């Protein structure tokens, strides 16, 4: 967990996206999803919502729509949730309401929703919606204009990790209903990683091997996780 | 494509799933697409092609696969699967309750002719009972999905995803190439044309056989000769790789 919304919006600008998606998990401990989206509107405006922020999300969102769906479930909630917030912020920054939102004081969840309720007076319910639609439009075009080198490179980055997360997640339920307490750590280990570090792929093999100790179906999964320890492990016996 | 529901259902019994999922596309041609009509044809067809308890249990494997987190069946492959499940439940109801006879004939009918048969037979089960039955069978089914052999599911998975992972990646290459800003690049247009055709070739394929690897390689080769962008390269690499390791892992397997 990071210390600030400012650090999370840094990760976003730093193309750190697996990390930035934890932003809504941060606001969870620092204060329903009705409340949630409004916290992130407050949080983003007080933390320097800009055009660059929108534009760098349009990469992330474009990655989300990829047919290979690297971001799914928990991560996909994170992504869409935040996106629901980005549009109101987009309405606010455009019609110059961003100020009534910006403050000094350290507010509480109840007090936040309080002023956002009051601020609703500055925007008729009918126009809020009209701008929301236009801001959506203006966004989705930037989603289309998203530089494909940036999108692509981002994708490997995310999916490098993400793939194993599902591959492993699936290895678990298949095993539970077919050692288990063991794998959950590999699930919880990998859960924490933002990227596959060459040091991280090392700790993986330190898992794969340790399972062998405790089924023909488990096979092709390890083969898809850490092939090399297998090739070693099998040849070791073949010389008996 | 295949010429017979018997052929398709055979594939389902054999375990050839990507092929089995091609069924509702055949049914759409054999008859000439409101989903209710399409589910109607599937029910008729499956009941004449020897719907049975084993058909259900194997289909359970397929579904269990569709629910993996790696999500091997997306989009149209997914629509196939779900549309077939909507036909499945009525058949389970008709099977348990001895209604199938009214659905069984050797007379080769038309779409309009089957939809009429379907409405005629609608009067042999009162709606309320159909819905109760329908849920009982759904219960009976989803339990079998929870119980599907982990061996059998895991095997279907590797061999569906084997093809299917390629399918989605190639679609994502395609849209990115289209969406790329390439002013100098005079080959972009002929490179897009290559990916589209690769996408098209692969769309018909249910497994990676020697032929497939070879065609894929022919496309990927031509693409390299078209002088791709930096980002395109990662895609080309994944699409036709050389997994000397995996080669060496499976031999040893």
Numbering used by the authors:
A (entry chain B): 1 to 31, 39 to 185, 196 to 231, 234 to 259
B (entry chain A): 1 to 32, 38 to 258
From the article:
Lpg0393 is a newly identified Legionella effector classified as a hypothetical protein. Through X-ray crystallographic analysis, we show that Lpg0393 contains a Vps9-like domain, which is structurally most similar to the catalytic core of human Rabex-5 that activates the endosomal Rab proteins Rab5, Rab21 and Rab22. Consistently, Lpg0393 exhibited a guanine-nucleotide exchange factor activity toward the endosomal Rabs. This work identifies the first example of a bacterial guanine-nucleotide exchange factor that is active towards the Rab5 sub-cluster members, implying that the activation of these Rab proteins might be advantageous for the intracellular survival of Legionella.
